[PDB]
């Protein structure tokens with residue numbers, strides 16, 4: 001029952017700030033069209049320190065740690081009438097690439113849906129002993145906002161020894177450009 | 192001291208071996224190896240098993256710095272290897288398991 005910060009995104013509200021990772025986070029993805037699609041876990045938020053990128057680019061789960069030149073607004077641009085991704089503007093530079101992983105090839109929900117939020121993805125990220133404990137929770141929901149009371153078990157999918165400096169992070173949204181713009185979505189910090 | 196909290200911290204329950212050998216003729220020169228450096232400078236300290244190669248100027252005891260400010264230097268400091276020195280300034284090469 002502890003206090004959970006609700007970062008909603010409406011057509012004007014565009015939020016992914018410097019959010020502290022201080023102990024680890026309990027992430028929630030109240031999604032209907034896969035708006036939230038990635039993170040960058042780092043400390044300095046530039047190309048100086050090592051930082052890792054974990055994204056889903058609707059083809060792969062791309063897991064990569066370099067000296068990424070952190071774009072101060074990371075986003076995906078998806079054409080709202082057409083329904084496909086146009087941009088991947090995440091990094092400017094990338095050097096001393098220390099970790100690489102790219103998952104299996106697929107195709108995901110890219111275009112914008114309407115109504116209630118279809119599915120909730122519950123993610124837990126923990127830095128212990130150089131590992132990045134990455135957990136997963138997933139069960140369908142149907143709600144507008146206001147994160148529901150529930151009961152489900154988070155499961156281990158990625159015990160990842162990245163070994164980098166993670167004191168902050170930043171969500172990677174998806175800008176639905178019909179000029180930028182969004183759709184209805186919300187994510188949660190969860191210390 | 193220097194290596195753990197700034198360069199790379201090691202946890203104190205799970206670790207393998209230290210594989211160090213003689214590299215006097217390889218890495219050093221009698222007047223100085225000014226080519227390789229270490230971190231003594233971080234806002235805060237490290238968690239165990241953590242790289243940090245930030246070329247951002249920090250403070251030596253964790254003080255927030257927008258440079259030019261007080262106590263804001265290079266992140267990196269010299270080694271200075273000689274072949275005409277003692278073992279404490281000889282260069283070795285350590286492989287961690």
Ligand SMILES: *[C@@H]1O[C@H](CO)[C@@H](O)[C@H](O)[C@H]1NC(C)=O
Nearest residue numbers: 001002003004005006147149
């Ligand atoms: C934090 O949560 C409690 C109950 O969980 C609630 O009463 C309180 O208002 C919340 N804090 C804020 C600032 O809303």
